[PDB]
Symmetry: D2
Subunit: 501 residues, 4 copies
Amino acid sequence: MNKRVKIVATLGPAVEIRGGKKFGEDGYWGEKLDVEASAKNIAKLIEAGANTFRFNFSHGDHQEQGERMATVKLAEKIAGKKVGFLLDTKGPEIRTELFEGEAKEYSYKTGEKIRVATKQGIKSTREVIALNVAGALDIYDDVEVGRQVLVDDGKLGLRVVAKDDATREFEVEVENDGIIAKQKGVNIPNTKIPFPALAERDNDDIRFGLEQGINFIAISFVRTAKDVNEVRAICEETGNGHVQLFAKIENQQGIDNLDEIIEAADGIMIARGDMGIEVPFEMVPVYQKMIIKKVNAAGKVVITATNMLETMTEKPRATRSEVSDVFNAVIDGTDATMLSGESANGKYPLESVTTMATIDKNAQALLNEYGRLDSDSFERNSKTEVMASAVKDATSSMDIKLVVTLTKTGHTARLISKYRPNADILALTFDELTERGLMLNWGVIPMLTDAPSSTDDMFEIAERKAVEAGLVESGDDIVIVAGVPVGEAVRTNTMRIRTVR
Amino acid sequence: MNKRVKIVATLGPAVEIRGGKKFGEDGYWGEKLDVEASAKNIAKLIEAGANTFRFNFSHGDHQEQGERMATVKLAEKIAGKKVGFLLDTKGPEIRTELFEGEAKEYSYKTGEKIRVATKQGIKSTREVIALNVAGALDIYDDVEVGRQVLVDDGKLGLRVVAKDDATREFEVEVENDGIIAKQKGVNIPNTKIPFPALAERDNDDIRFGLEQGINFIAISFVRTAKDVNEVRAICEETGNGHVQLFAKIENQQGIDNLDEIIEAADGIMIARGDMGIEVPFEMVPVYQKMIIKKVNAAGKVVITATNMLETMTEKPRATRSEVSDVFNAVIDGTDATMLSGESANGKYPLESVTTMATIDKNAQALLNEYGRLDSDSFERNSKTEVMASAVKDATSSMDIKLVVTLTKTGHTARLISKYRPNADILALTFDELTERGLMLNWGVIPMLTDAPSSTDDMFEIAERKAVEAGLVESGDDIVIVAGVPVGEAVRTNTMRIRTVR
Amino acid sequence: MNKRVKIVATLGPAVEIRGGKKFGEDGYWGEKLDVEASAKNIAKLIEAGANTFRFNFSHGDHQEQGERMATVKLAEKIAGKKVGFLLDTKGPEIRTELFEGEAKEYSYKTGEKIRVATKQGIKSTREVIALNVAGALDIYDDVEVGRQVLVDDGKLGLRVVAKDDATREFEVEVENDGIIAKQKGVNIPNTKIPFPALAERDNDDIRFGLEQGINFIAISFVRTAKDVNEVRAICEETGNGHVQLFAKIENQQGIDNLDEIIEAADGIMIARGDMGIEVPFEMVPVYQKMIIKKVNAAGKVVITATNMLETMTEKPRATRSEVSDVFNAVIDGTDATMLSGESANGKYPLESVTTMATIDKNAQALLNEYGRLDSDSFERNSKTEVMASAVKDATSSMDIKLVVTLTKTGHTARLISKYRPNADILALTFDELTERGLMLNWGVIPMLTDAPSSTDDMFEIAERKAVEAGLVESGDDIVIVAGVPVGEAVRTNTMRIRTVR
Amino acid sequence: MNKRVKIVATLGPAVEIRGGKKFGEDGYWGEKLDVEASAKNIAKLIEAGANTFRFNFSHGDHQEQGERMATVKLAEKIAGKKVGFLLDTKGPEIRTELFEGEAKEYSYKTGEKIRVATKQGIKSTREVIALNVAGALDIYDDVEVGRQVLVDDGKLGLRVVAKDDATREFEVEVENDGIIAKQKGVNIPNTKIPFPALAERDNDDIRFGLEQGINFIAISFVRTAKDVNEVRAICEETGNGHVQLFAKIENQQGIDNLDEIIEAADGIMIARGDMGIEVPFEMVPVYQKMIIKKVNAAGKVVITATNMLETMTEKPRATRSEVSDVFNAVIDGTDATMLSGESANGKYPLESVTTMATIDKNAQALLNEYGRLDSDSFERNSKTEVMASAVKDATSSMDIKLVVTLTKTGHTARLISKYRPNADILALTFDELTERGLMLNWGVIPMLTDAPSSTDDMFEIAERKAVEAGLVESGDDIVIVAGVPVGEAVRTNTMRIRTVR
Ligand SMILES: O=P(O)(O)OC[C@H]1O[C@](O)(COP(=O)(O)O)[C@@H](O)[C@@H]1O
Ligand SMILES: O=P(O)(O)OC[C@H]1O[C@](O)(COP(=O)(O)O)[C@@H](O)[C@@H]1O
Ligand SMILES: [Mg+2]
Ligand SMILES: [Mg+2]
Ligand SMILES: [Mg+2]
Ligand SMILES: [Mg+2]
């Protein structure tokens, strides 16, 4: 079993060593980053099956993101395996501020009376939590007495009992025991804060990440196709048209506009953290199944995100509900499953990726029996898609160890992946940007190779690259597709069934 | 809209008021039990959708259990609604003992060296953990070095590093941070402790339970049909033949013998806490889907259990993986979903029941689209089952608000329930024991009524009881089944499609 | 096996004895009809499974039709079984005339030069065949040199080589050996003769048949819904609204207008004789399958007609192609199969009905495996149809010997028949016109009984009538439907599964 | 549009010109055979769609058969198209003998008393019918009084009223009007004549046939696999191992042993004439549908035979039941439809082939909608069959005009044919024997070409041969399969989707 379901792992301090100390150790924050020791930890997550690392720009600053991206470039070399680089934007969001004196968080008890500030550009204290509102908007008049302020995926609730005009502070009662840490997501349900089109901060974050070299952007709180097209414009103007945009669906407007968002984007991230606060929590499983189906029908990538192995933040074993969630995301048809705090923030980042890889690998064996996606229903809209349908058929008719596609742009590999064959897909492509671009497609193992010449045997190349990567051995049956011959073929036009020598 | 998926709520101190104090408040345990304030609390759980309470005999003593059962009996009169009474057995298991000087539990850090004792009838120290082993078995010779000892559904791991012959103690390294409380599960995977057929303790607990008045027994660690038959023999012997037995499947032996266990039992509880430590965690979802399908095909009851809303033990809102888990259990075909520590041991027992109820109600609306069960594949093996298939056909042909069955024993209601009609099922029955015994069947609303005479119009009765229960109004279409006429019919033989006037 | 597929048998001289002589014997035509001896022959066709007799008004005169109808009324009394009375109209057709000197036919050889007259109201001779054109139309100018004149379902072809203006005769070459008999169908393909709306002759024929007492009219060459509504108007004005209209589809205009014709009519007769000459012969099997499907979807009656056992006109055994045709008409979903010359004109009328009954009975056993009709696809458009769906389901779930419906108008019996249950359908109705009206519905055995009173047990009546008709015995399982109670029920609202005592 | 369903046409005097005279013209038999005029006639049958001619060795002598086979060989050069040569064996059967004084046949009326003789090597009189019994068996002791003797596929019945010991004759009553000709079938249902394993006569006929050059043998009255293996042994012994054996199923024993016969044979001829006298006539359609399904699942050829256009023996147009029969045989899944007396013995042999071809072409357009065969259910049991499944998938995904297979032995063409793709199949093969042997496979157009070298581009070759045959034009999409490269490939291993330039 190669793992066909892709893992997005969020990076953060959990994997980072600072002056020989690990996250949680006394004096950790007084040290600087040990890049090699950090890259060694990250190389172990790559080996365990992380296919793409997520850099959440709601956390840290550019320097911290930039160094973390450099640490992954080193980790790839140590692992001898490449991964995707995914930037996750702030979007039209509210975050808790940094605290005075670089305290990182405080703990609160049910019934404490604290304040939430609206004034922009200040720091929090334990008693007066300051907000970073996208567009530096003033939200004091948008939030009435009786509104709930939710901190960190709704873990901690603050009930607005009064408003203090002298300070423009919400007077709040802590509804339940919990923590307020710096740069935490804030939700105020049933309010209609007028966030701008694309915040200056998002424009700067995106341009910085594009300069560092990324493959993917996940756009937070996509409301309409315009939100995706604003980011697309920046990618194309900076010479970064190869970068793929995943719309994060995490509010009613995103659900209402799903069809236009899917057409504009390269994929969807089902951002269930915010989604289950911005829409009825009991509706998230309905939307999850429907989004995965539509995205797969469009030949695009879907990521299922948030709380997948939440307990593994503190404990070496997931709950029964967490394992059920990962398993059922695979059965629903997801291309990729995501870790957030499990990998970024937790005591068991490596064990989290391992555990997720084990569940994903066991669930992929039940797709023939239980799988929700139905490739038989698709219209085959092009001759490459006809070929992808024929490859699925061959992998259904007999035991195929591997499908190999020689793909210039990844088009053939994406269409084979869409049909969910009962085989791994080796995608041989001829440039690194295409190779990294395929790292979140179901079943696709991207591999860089030289562009075939008109004298090359592409079928010999396919078998040799598969053997040299240890994916197949003598006697295995593989399906190879290619455009034959090189420099005459318009598209993938040939399928070969080949016994490996 | 009526909740078709049934809720088993485990009762515990979480819902109990002690001289004005709630569970988790200073000096809670000092106070006498406020029976009436406790019954008012339990009454809210009934109103929120708890269909059966679970009395877990692994905790407390006969006095405590018997008191709790009496308090539920008052809660029913407050709520104006009856519930099922389910006894959950200790079973062939290992618990932690009570601690010296009524200390409730202790906390341990990774690398800590402590001891686990095999001598029976002793109480635990922080530094030496006593075991209450079923059958007071000496297990010291059963447990090799390098074996794993897990406490509290596997939360805390203890590696056996050495064995002390002179005290017959395990010298154990704490693997991970966690808590050792009183009367918690201990799992030693891949050991073969020869636990008795039925332990004296279980025999005593079942007999006390039967004396108090119960509807269900959930038998822990059912290994073979013999485990079910020993308990069935006590039910019959004491005149409690109406008591239904759910086999808890929570190890490989239970899985291997599942078919003969389903045949001996009235139902299966999928006990996923133990199951996911005793077998590979990533297989539990495979077994959950297969058990629900098999139990439904047998016309019996399936309960999905453990960790369903786990985070709500400590937080007012569940994680996205927990909502996914509850939803997917309903889609899989579960008759019932269960709360353990969420209702027994948590800060949010009412909100846990409400949340589960909300998810279960939403999931039931997607069983047409997504439902795994397939009633079309069933053999109809009796004339009542043919009537059940016809009822299901009527609810597929047109919009039926309610199915009404006049059922002496519940057999017709159980068959209609097996077919999962697109409608609520009102089961009009003539005794309280039959009424309570239907409370875990999917979609069944048990209601007590006078046995109709051969003078009575049972179709008028059905409509009148459905209107009086506020399940239907003028213009609603209903399907009524009955054995016509009373004193001649030997079974349900008539189906009526009626418009409520 | 009761035969569920209905047989329409065409009556003619084959069954008629004249002064002790049988059809074909010397001096036969010099005798008058022996009514009792003729009614005895016809009683044997009823016993063999003829459900409806067809009186083809293209043949004979009113007196001959009237006496044949009287002979069947006697045959019913002798057989002790009722049959339907079906009148088949001339329609907008061309027929060969009577011959001079009551010669009935002549024989011709390939290459003979004869004439066809256009002058209306004259008799034929061997050398000059006169036409009876509906509306007494003059067709001399509508038929050019090179047209084909086809006699008798296209058995004999006449090529128009010249036109003689002095006599207004077509000069024809006999294309193949064959016969021209009196009152034979004539087709001239690729001509557009302007037949009127409803010929005076058809108006008189219909009114005569309505006076004699008929159940059905098959309207020849239905072109549009107007053709059906013209006949409907006459039925309603004469107090004969109970008479059912079957549109004969036998030309392109009928195929083009099929949907409006089905909505206007009570059923379709697939008149393949003319159809296979008026449209491409290879298209008739396509249209047959499509018409049966649409008519069944409309809850109406379909008859498959012509050449079904053609060889049995002269021989005691059908060809392999004939048996295949009857079998496949049943598999396609036909309510009824028809005999024409086999019963009207042949040496083996009784053996023809027997042979057809044997094929139909063997094919009805393969409907579950091979049957084309798909009741699962129907929308259930009324509560009686919901009940019909539920009856189908019961007959699919277990072995049901009989479905009994107490039906005032036949509505419940038609809807049960539409769903094609795996059981015979006993339709108990309370007037003879309804009883005869159901004789061509698939599976329906109509039986006359007294209208139940409010003190009657309709379920006891259903079982008693079924037992007394020898359809069921002690131990058989039957499904009874009724509107319960009499004088309150709006519709069939009750289904009972009953073991016969 | 190309005819996918293949036509077997039985040759006979009907197509033979004798010194200027056609069959059925006065003094036909006086004249010498006009070989060249006969070959011109047979050439028209080839052009009209005859794919194989059947030489029925129950008629004539080696001289007659050998001459006819030579005349077909000239017809091929005239038509410019090859056909298959099928020998149909006499088999373990009873024929009528030749009559005294070269009288061709006699006519008999019902109630006529005549005799049937058991003495072998004598010629028939009108009043005493000699039998040519296979093995020259004496059957007098095999045939009881009240047994039925049927002549000419059961047209004429003869009741055995008494047995004459002194002449060993049956005294027989004519049951029905009909004809006793020379060398006609005699069936005595429910007798057990111990016919040899393989008769000397069959051994001689097969050996003569093989010496002339044939592609197929149809073995009459195959009872067991042993009947097939005796003939296979002669084919192998004489170096004729390429000859394909169709078992004729025409009695209950053949039906009972069908599975072992399909396994021994290359195909089944459903010989319905005999079958519908030897088993109940109404079962033939049940057996026809089941045989076609089984033979197709085995990847072998099925021929549906007898009475398909029977009326066209005497009339230029077929009945509606005959067109229904041909159409339904195609829908059932038949590879081939057959003409017997229609082509051999009739007035309209060319028109019979044309008519069958027209119906077969129309029916093939409805196999998507109505087709009984289901290729989705098949096990794909080899890599060539996986390629066949993939080809079928491509023709379902997009509009493919043609499938082209470069096939050494026809194995790839036979598998593609088994899958019934929505396309014609051009089979490019390198020898005439393989070419002719594919002529009865559904959809296969065999074409002879040079064996490609490892220098050649087989995909260019495929396109060029398809264009040269006028099967495709510029812009048409085609699927080509081949073993790439020649001299390395051990099987068809490549599929190409190509647009014709
Ligand atoms: O078959 P489709 O969907 O029209 O795609 C054809 C396009 O795909 C491509 O072959 C690219 O495919 P690959 O990147 O997989 O090689 C283009 O060259 C071609 O224009
Ligand atoms: O259920 P539907 O299709 O509305 O039909 C209802 C009608 O059918 C009838 O019950 C007649 O049915 P029967 O003739 O079968 O008794 C009418 O009384 C009633 O108005
Ligand atoms: Mg979010
Ligand atoms: Mg347990
Ligand atoms: Mg007609
Ligand atoms: Mg034969």
